[PDB]
Design a protein around this motif. Structure first.
Motif, PDB file in Angstrom:
ATOM      1  N   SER A 158       6.568   8.323  -3.444  1.00  0.00           N
ATOM      2  CA  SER A 158       5.756   9.455  -3.003  1.00  0.00           C
ATOM      3  C   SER A 158       6.135   9.935  -1.593  1.00  0.00           C
ATOM      4  CB  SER A 158       4.271   9.099  -3.065  1.00  0.00           C
ATOM      5  OG  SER A 158       3.997   8.033  -2.171  1.00  0.00           O
ATOM      6  N   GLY A 200      -2.192   9.126   8.857  1.00  0.00           N
ATOM      7  CA  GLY A 200      -2.458   8.913   7.438  1.00  0.00           C
ATOM      8  C   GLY A 200      -1.816   9.856   6.444  1.00  0.00           C
ATOM      9  N   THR A 201      -2.375   9.853   5.234  1.00  0.00           N
ATOM     10  CA  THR A 201      -1.830  10.548   4.072  1.00  0.00           C
ATOM     11  C   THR A 201      -1.727  12.074   4.231  1.00  0.00           C
ATOM     12  OG1 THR A 201      -2.593   8.785   2.605  1.00  0.00           O
ATOM     13  CG2 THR A 201      -2.151  10.916   1.566  1.00  0.00           C
ATOM     14  N   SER A 202      -2.703  12.677   4.906  1.00  0.00           N
ATOM     15  CA  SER A 202      -2.698  14.121   5.119  1.00  0.00           C
ATOM     16  C   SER A 202      -1.529  14.579   5.991  1.00  0.00           C
ATOM     17  CB  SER A 202      -4.027  14.581   5.707  1.00  0.00           C
ATOM     18  OG  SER A 202      -4.202  14.058   7.004  1.00  0.00           O
ATOM     19  N   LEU A 256       1.530  13.023   5.923  1.00  0.00           N
ATOM     20  CA  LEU A 256       2.646  12.977   4.979  1.00  0.00           C
ATOM     21  C   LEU A 256       2.757  14.256   4.165  1.00  0.00           C
ATOM     22  CD1 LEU A 256       2.849   9.314   3.579  1.00  0.00           C
ATOM     23  CD2 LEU A 256       4.528  10.526   5.044  1.00  0.00           C
ATOM     24  N   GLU A 257       1.624  14.694   3.618  1.00  0.00           N
ATOM     25  CA  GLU A 257       1.539  15.901   2.795  1.00  0.00           C
ATOM     26  C   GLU A 257       1.810  17.185   3.582  1.00  0.00           C
ATOM     27  OE1 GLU A 257      -2.471  15.652   1.197  1.00  0.00           O
ATOM     28  OE2 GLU A 257      -1.800  14.387  -0.466  1.00  0.00           O
ATOM     29  N   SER A 312      -7.267   5.852   6.137  1.00  0.00           N
ATOM     30  CA  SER A 312      -8.645   5.804   5.651  1.00  0.00           C
ATOM     31  C   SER A 312      -9.498   4.822   6.443  1.00  0.00           C
ATOM     32  CB  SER A 312      -8.673   5.407   4.173  1.00  0.00           C
ATOM     33  OG  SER A 312      -8.338   4.037   4.025  1.00  0.00           O
ATOM     34  N   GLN A 325       0.830  -1.197   0.000  1.00  0.00           N
ATOM     35  CA  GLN A 325       0.000   0.000   0.000  1.00  0.00           C
ATOM     36  C   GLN A 325       0.868   1.252   0.000  1.00  0.00           C
ATOM     37  OE1 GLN A 325      -3.938   0.240   2.019  1.00  0.00           O
ATOM     38  NE2 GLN A 325      -3.161   2.102   2.997  1.00  0.00           N
ATOM     39  N   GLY A 326       0.506   2.193  -0.869  1.00  0.00           N
ATOM     40  CA  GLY A 326       1.244   3.440  -1.049  1.00  0.00           C
ATOM     41  C   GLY A 326       2.378   3.296  -2.044  1.00  0.00           C
ATOM     42  N   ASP A 342      -2.602   4.989   4.995  1.00  0.00           N
ATOM     43  CA  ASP A 342      -3.296   6.170   4.502  1.00  0.00           C
ATOM     44  C   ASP A 342      -4.277   6.743   5.532  1.00  0.00           C
ATOM     45  OD1 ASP A 342      -5.588   4.568   4.313  1.00  0.00           O
ATOM     46  OD2 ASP A 342      -5.505   4.393   2.142  1.00  0.00           O
TER      47      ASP A 342
END
Ligand SMILES: O=C([O-])CC(=O)C(=O)O
Ligand SMILES: [Mn+2]
Ligand SMILES: [Mn+2]
Ligand code: NA
Length: 606
Positions: free
Chosen positions: A13, A168-170, A172-173, A40, A8-9, A38
């Protein structure tokens, strides 16, 4: 290149430094798969269902999305004797004691840790998935928030981190190419299993070690899958690593609840309170006040990160995203708001289960309907008059903070909430009054340093409720607290000390407590406001005669509850003196010694 192993992922990135951390430790730990979380809902549900089919967790059928894990009985709590901090110099981590061994932390040398690490981590995730958890301690956008990346082979850890942190993903960003705390965790059971698996709970007690390397911004934990040992954001990051970052950067990382309190005239204040582990933080933070027109709202129940702003306000955030509370003793009458919180989306560890598929524990105060039977935390049938408790004394719930019905509307405000009072407290059956107020900032810091609480046939020291949690030298921590008085324009909060646990001469509690503690909070509220409601004593200011609202309480024994004995306080101040001399020794700040001498002097004159 571990690209071929990512389920996953993508490694591509990931920000450069996050990728290095993942791949470096993948090379070392030899996981079969890499799963970049992530955060989710789908990821969470699937993860839980996978644990369910592997016998790792059980679904609780009475509730909406609630789960139960039962551990290997060898892996049931934080183990302080295997918890360490590594620095070049021991003195930077713990003061050097005058007489005995340090009670204020555990240092391990860089050389000793390296050997320990090499004896544990190589190949430790063979046959398992390495989960990569990007998480934020604090509201994503907050200037007070800090980001970590936890690597773990435990799905139990992943699910619990989703609740206890923002994951999660937010994250990382948000991180980008910023700094983050590196967190490495393994249960220490590579496949094929060398040792028998107990209760489908992978762990390695013999080799359990939880290490902190503040200079390298790393937390490294091996052998335990349990709570504070494995959920690295919790204690390792939020107190130990964080108290050191705070020392360096001019803020505070504390073992404090944060609550917001509004009076019948619309005035709201925020308070922070530090009580020793398992004493009643969640109870106070989530109380339903008994006094009409008053309201309490929860910001946090365990950790506070606090920084003075440019205007001089002490701004605090709760760095956590959920509550990891002690289950036994939680009831409708003791904590109704916590009960409402844990009804859905909650993970329970080491509690009992009813035949209806419900949760059970000691002091739940819920009579069961005829027919309903109980299964203990040891997965055996249980009776009310049996030898053993049905739930482990250290059993837990792990629940989302947003589910608290009285969660404060500013609980994730990026700027934090303004703290106007700080409360210290312990369990003292004798000698110590219900509430007193510190004479000054310096006296207040001394009060925190002098904290003691019963643990029940021994009274032990727990300064600032941080004894198992100091990230660095406790003497330097005291100096750090005292330095706040010299920061220009700082609005220093009032310091109080509370004791809910004072008894009479035959063992009975003198104070009803729980919701009735709102009465003590009211007094603090007024003192912060400048109310002339206080009387000077040798130990600090106490409520004047009739200053406390005691209406509806019957005949509370105010003489005993607020009594101060010269004989008791002579002994007390003697005890604190010897403790500070021994445990703090050369790093004891002048002002603390001065406060101690002053207290001794005031007592001598009564
Ligand atoms: O150890 C933990 O994570 C639970 C806790 O808040 C404490 O016992 O201080
Ligand atoms: Mn705690
Ligand atoms: Mn000073
Ligand atoms: Na189990």
């Amino acid at each position: 290149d571990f690209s071929a192993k990512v389920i996953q992922g993508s490694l591509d990135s990931l920000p450069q430094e996050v990728r290095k951390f993942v791949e470096g430790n993948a090379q070392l730990c030899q996981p079969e798969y890499i799963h970049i979380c992530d955060g989710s809902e789908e990821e969470y549900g699937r993860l839980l269902a996978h644990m369910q089919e592997e016998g790792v967790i059980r679904k609780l059928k009475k509730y909406d999305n609630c789960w139960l894990a039962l551990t290997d009985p060898r892996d049931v709590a934080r183990i302080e004797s295997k918890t360490v901090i590594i620095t070049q110099e021991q003195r930077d981590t713990v003061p050097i004691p005058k007489s005995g061994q340090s009670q204020l932390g555990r240092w391990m040398s860089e050389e000793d840790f390296e050997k320990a690490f090499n004896a544990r981590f190589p190949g430790c995730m063979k046959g398992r998935t390495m989960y990569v958890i990007p998480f934020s301690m604090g509201p994503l956008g907050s200037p007070l928030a800090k980001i970590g990346i936890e690597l773990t082979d435990s799905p139990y850890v992943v699910a619990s981190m989703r609740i206890m942190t923002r994951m999660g993903t937010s994250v990382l960003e948000a991180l980008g190419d910023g700094e983050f705390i590196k967190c490495l965790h393994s249960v220490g059971c590579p496949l094929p299993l060398k040792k028998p698996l107990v209760n489908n709970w992978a762990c390695n007690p013999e080799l359990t070690l939880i290490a902190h390397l503040p200079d390298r911004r790393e937390i490294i934990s091996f052998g335990s899958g349990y709570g504070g040992n494995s959920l690295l954001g919790k204690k390792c990051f939020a107190l130990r690593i964080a108290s050191r970052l705070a020392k360096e950067e001019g803020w505070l990382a504390e073992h404090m609840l944060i609550l917001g309190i509004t009076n019948p005239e619309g005035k709201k204040k925020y308070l922070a309170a530090a009580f020793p582990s398992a004493c009643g933080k969640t109870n106070l933070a989530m109380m339903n006040p008994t006094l009409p027109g008053w309201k309490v709202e929860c910001v946090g129940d365990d950790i506070a990160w606090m920084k003075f702003d440019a205007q001089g306000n002490l701004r605090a955030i709760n760095p956590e995203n959920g509550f990891f509370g002690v289950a036994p003793g939680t009831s409708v009458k003791t904590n109704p708001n916590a009960i409402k919180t844990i009804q859905k989306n909650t993970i329970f560890t080491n509690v009992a289960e009813t035949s209806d598929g419900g949760v059970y524990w000691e002091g739940i105060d819920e009579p069961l309907a005829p027919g309903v039977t109980i299964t203990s935390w040891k997965n055996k049938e249980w009776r009310p008059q049996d030898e053993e408790p049905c739930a482990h004394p250290n059993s837990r719930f792990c629940t989302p903070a947003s589910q608290c019905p009285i969660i404060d509307p500013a609980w994730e405000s990026p700027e934090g909430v303004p703290i106007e009072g700080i409360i210290f407290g312990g369990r003292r059956p004798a000698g110590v009054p219900l509430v007193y107020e510190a004479l000054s900032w310096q006296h207040g810091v001394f009060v925190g340093a002098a904290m003691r609480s019963e643990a029940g046939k021994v009274i032990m020291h727990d300064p600032f409720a941080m004894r198992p949690f100091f990230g660095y030298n406790f003497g330097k921590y005291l100096a750090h607290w005292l330095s706040m008085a010299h920061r220009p324009a700082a609005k220093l909060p009032k310091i109080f000390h509370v004791n809910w646990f004072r008894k009479d001469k035959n063992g009975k509690f003198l104070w009803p407590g729980f919701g009735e503690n709102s009465r003590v909070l009211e007094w603090m509220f007024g003192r912060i406001e400048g109310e002339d409601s206080a009387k000077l004593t040798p130990i600090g200011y106490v409520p004047k005669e009739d200053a406390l609202n005691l209406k509806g309480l019957g005949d509370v024994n105010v003489e005993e509850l607020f009594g101060i004995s010269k004989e008791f306080w002579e002994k007390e101040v003697e005890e604190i003196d010897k403790y500070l001399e021994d445990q703090v020794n050369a790093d004891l700040p002048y002002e603390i010694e001065r406060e101690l001498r002053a207290l001794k002097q005031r007592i001598s004159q009564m």
